[PDB]
């Protein structure tokens, strides 16, 4: 079977920092990776450049490799490697390895063998960024059973982007358009921070695990001689040219069936058992709420911090160092402060009672920026309020305790000094967190929050109140921008798009209450507004530029550094994407994101820039126009409120 | 391609003190360098001559040298070198290296092993400033695509001046010459602080890369081989001797087109596709109103910090000695308050309580004067700062003392430990207000044109803002406009768009605007009233106001201020006059005159401007620039801009 040889280094396993320091108070450094439990390991090896310390004894200094509890290695220091930079090869047997593994590497030090400080820093060991885990995977046959799905199409102990192709057979319908839509909500919204990408192909076929759509007419040209179906079934054969990769063949009547299939998949994946699946009959029993989405907080009422933890290990910590425990709480970027009183959080923290009172302070710290320090001299319920005031769509909690334990040394020639001990750190489980006195009610024209959160159409967890309106006959391109953007929004929400709605003409809008969604081409029922900023043509566009242009704007904007003051026009031969977001002329309270191309060239952009987080991240403001020098955005445009 | 040796020396690229001393409390010293983004870095190796303490311990005390986190080799002190002189070289891979790296140093000292205190002044390392980075840079080639603009011209990851020298065709009339302007004022713009230099050549291409400009009928050389263009188009074509340097085209039918196609360089260049752009329609909306410029802070409303960053973790510091937080204010010139209150601000900082109260305090600062001081013992503190040294462009420093209460133990047993670190914070939310101030002060000196270029600069676009030039200007006085105009833009953040660059004086009669004279004063100026310095290319006259006293008070007085005796007299050297005075026709409009003797007078004139070292040092109403540098002096009658 096929088998690849991929060689992951040590800048995207490591800390984000990169090169990681092995001190006395933390000499472990644990570096994760996993298989999708279908590939096998084989001929895999670790290769360490690490830098000793001059002062640390050569025989007395050792580093220890631990792939799962397992000392696969010992690398002592020598004499020559005192302060030289060594290159180490570690051979790491195929055997130990599971499903996930942590390796682990340990450094030991002793610089002095009679007065020995401990924690000093003078001993020092760090691994270089260079380094890297050559392993290669050599792929199995799989069992070819629908029981276990997703997992053969998406696995999620993969840490690279999913990459899920959908096949077609050309000029899809309005049900499919939107079935397909719903299945790559519900796999981006499986996928999460992993990061999707749904190359579509019509009537070809990948060699990568894709899903094949079928509805007794207009089948790809491979799926010959097949059983028509009474009702909507999902079936999972293998590739005709290598038995080695699975597909997805869906099939139904109509493109009601169809959809039906999709609904049932997108939500009743808990049933799935044998090969195929029949569904006939899926209802709901009551509409979402607004702003509830599995993977935002609860800003109704306060959650406890128990609702919060990734794993249950991550609310404690031990060692002589104790290390900071971080929480990510994902909200909508609709949170208002309007009484600047921030919010109010019960922090039930039990700590270890130090020596002497020292303050062994802990500081809490938001994105990097601290808030308050509570001294330390064991359960205290303090009130803490935070001025937060820069709470966007995600944040991180920090709570470090520094620990300083004073050990007695005695005199100069009394020479006598004590082991540290560790201590143990445990937040209070039931610890809360208020998100209620905030509001909702922010600037709409801005699409930061539609790039970090998707705000804009992810009012409601379904997109019930969400149009998406695409040209007659879609091409690939615009079909793989739709279930890109469409994949991105179900990822950065926790439930998929169940009730959205799709259609081929553009005065179908007309008098409805809904988000409109443009992906291919403007159309001429509202491209009169003129609040369209960027309009991207065949050749030629016009741009409007504000009359001040400040890096980090204030809590509330202006009408002063907003309006447009110049009007520029140009034409070229070049390639060019546009996301423009504006007011919808049938609705003063519901928006309009659009993102636009001309050429196959600017979609392949559009589609780099909206599936890689990296680079979508990183636009704000009204306007945005992604070129081969990334993406630049610009706030052009009057500023309208959303919310109450 | 062509390799240039570069040797950054420790004095250019590290703070401002000269040399660093890495202590046991703040051991870590930065440096910080950039790349082009289109050239690589090879053989690359940093020498260092370092000075140790001789209390230190031989093998566990040394030095790291990172580079961008990564050690890339550490260096002990050997016991014969401990307290003298050490030289020490170490490669820098250059893999490692980015668009723009920090290379920090960490000093780890122990003098002694039992009892060893931080915060001693008994264990140090210092470098000296004689030590630099020795790299040689070898550029590529870039892809010639426009998507990148203006990154082959001017790269926001360089340190050094912007030179880009400007081939024109060769004598160019009032439109060329304001398209050029309009640009250098764009490129001004967007290079800033870093210093701008804009060379003009005619019908010579230059080495570095430059912008051509054409007109569809004078051709300039080198270009009659390309076709004619029926619009305005910007094409990036290489230098045929060495395709290694990239020439910027600039094509239109008629100086109107070229003009119409320097306004969309300056303000549409976000959306510049490919190559061979073609500009049609650039109009504008609305006007600008005054006192309005990006750098510049606003005043019609009271200004918070978080629009005063530039910056991610300006506002908060960290480690033992929490390093001090400065954010720069950029106020116009033109301020005056009658009720002498001073500019009142809501500061918001927050900070880690310590233990004890020990008087750890905080002191805010102004120019790098004390300004005020705060006991820590989270706050929204009302600060009236007493306006003294608010002049152009200030610094207000926000600096942590703080003092830790650590016990040592008894004399018979002492504690060891290690120190722990402390926090601070101001936080993007205080606010400072500025609208309790008017714009009116008495503007003859040229401080504050030197400083921020204000009686041209009181719109960033310089709409009302004339600029004579003499006819068929040769290059000097081309590069002298260019210059001045580039530098008028970089003081503030928006290219001079509406500009307007006349020939004959029958323009200046009747127009309420700003004059701005380049090649000489024309026949219905110089009167010989309120104007000083006249040079006829041959001798020069000059008055004293019958006194020179520095340092003047806040509000000038009119006694001092007063011509005693005009001294007349001929030479044979070269010299530069820049004269501030007010126009006859309007009372608040006023006139700034930069005029050269010789070559040799343009030549300094230009390089004077140039600068930014010999240029802060300019105030009064004249400046005498010489061979020997510049003086200046306040002479003249007083008129007041401003209601």
């Given at each position: ?35 999708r ?14 830098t ?6 050569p ?9 799962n ?6 690398l002592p ?10 290159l ?8 130990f ?31 270089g960024?260079?380094?890297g ?50 299945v ?82 997108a ?6 058992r044998?090969?195929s ?13 607004p702003?509830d ?13 128990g ?41 039930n923290?039990r700590?270890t ?30 009130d ?47 610890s ?8 909702h ?36 391109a ?6 890109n ?6 990822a ?12 081929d ?34 050749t ?30 140009l ?74």
């Amino acid at each position: 079977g096929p088998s690849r040889d991929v060689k992951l280094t040590f800048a995207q396993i490591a800390p984000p920092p990169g090169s990681m320091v092995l001190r006395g108070i933390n000499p472990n450094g644990s570096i994760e990776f996993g298989m999708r439990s279908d590939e096998v390991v084989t001929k895999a090896m670790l290769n360490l450049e690490y830098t000793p310390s001059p002062s640390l004894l050569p025989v007395q200094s050792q580093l220890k490799v631990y792939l799962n509890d397992e000392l696969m290695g010992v690398l002592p220091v020598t004499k020559e490697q005192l302060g030289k930079k060594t290159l180490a090869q570690m051979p790491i047997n195929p055997l130990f390895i599971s499903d996930f593994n942590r390796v682990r590497l340990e450094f030991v030090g002793h610089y002095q063998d009679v007065c020995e400080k401990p924690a000093s820093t003078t001993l020092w060991l760090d691994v270089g960024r260079s380094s890297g885990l050559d392993l290669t995977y050599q792929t199995l046959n799989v069992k070819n059973d629908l029981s276990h799905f997703p997992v053969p199409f998406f696995d999620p102990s993969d840490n690279r982007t999913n990459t899920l192709p959908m096949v077609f057979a050309g000029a899809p319908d309005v049900g499919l358009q939107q079935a397909s839509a719903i299945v790559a909500s519900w796999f981006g919204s499986r996928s999460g921070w992993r990061g999707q990408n749904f190359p579509v192909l019509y009537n070809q076929l990948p060699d990568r695990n894709a899903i094949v759509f079928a509805t007794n007419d207009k089948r790809p040209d491979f799926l010959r001689d097949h059983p028509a179906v009474k009702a909507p079934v999902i079936e999972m054969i293998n590739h005709p040219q290598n038995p080695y990769v699975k597909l997805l063949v869906v099939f139904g009547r109509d493109d009601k069936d169809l959809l039906q299939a999709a609904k049932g998949i997108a939500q009743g994946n808990i049933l799935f058992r044998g090969e195929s699946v029949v569904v006939n009959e899926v209802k709901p029993l009551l509409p979402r709420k607004p702003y509830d989405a599995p993977n935002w907080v609860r800003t109704d009422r306060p959650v406890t911090f128990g609702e919060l933890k990734t794993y249950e290990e991550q609310l404690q910590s031990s060692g002589l160092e104790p290390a900071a425990i971080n929480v990510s709480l994902n909200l909508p970027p609709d949170l208002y402060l309007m009484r600047s009183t921030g919010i109010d959080m019960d922090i039930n923290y039990r700590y270890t009672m130090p020596p002497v009172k020292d303050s062994s302070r802990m500081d809490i710290s938001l994105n990097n920026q601290f808030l308050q320090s509570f001294n330390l001299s064991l359960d205290g319920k303090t009130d803490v309020s935070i001025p937060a005031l820069k709470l966007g769509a995600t944040n991180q909690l920090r709570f470090d305790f520094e620990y300083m334990n004073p050990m007695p040394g005695g005199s100069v020639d009394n020479c006598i000094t004590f082991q540290p001990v560790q201590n143990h750190v445990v937040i209070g489980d039931d610890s809360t967190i208020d998100f209620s006195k905030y509001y909702h009610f922010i600037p709409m024209p801005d699409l930061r929050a539609f790039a970090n959160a998707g705000f804009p159409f992810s009012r409601m967890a379904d997109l019930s109140q969400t149009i998406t309106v695409m040209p007659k006959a879609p091409n690939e391109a615009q079909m793989e921008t739709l279930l890109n953007t469409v994949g991105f929004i179900g990822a950065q929400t926790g439930f998929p798009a169940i009730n959205l709605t799709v259609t081929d003409d553009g005065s179908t809008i007309q008098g409805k209450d809904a988000d409109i969604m443009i992906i291919g081409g403007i159309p001429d029922k509202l491209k009169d507004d003129k609040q369209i900023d960027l309009l991207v043509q065949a050749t030629e566009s016009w741009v409007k530029t504000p009359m001040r242009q400040t890096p980090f704007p204030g809590i509330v904007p202006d009408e002063s550094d907003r309006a447009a003051e110049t009007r520029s026009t140009l034409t070229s031969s070049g390639a060019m994407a546009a996301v423009i977001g504006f007011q919808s002329p049938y609705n003063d309270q519901r928006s309009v994101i659009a993102l636009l191309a001309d050429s196959p060239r600017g979609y392949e952009m559009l589609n780099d820039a909206v599936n890689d987080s990296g680079k979508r991240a990183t636009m704000f403001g009204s306007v945005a126009v992604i070129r081969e020098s990334g993406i630049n955005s610009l706030r052009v445009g009057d500023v309208y409120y959303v919310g109450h």
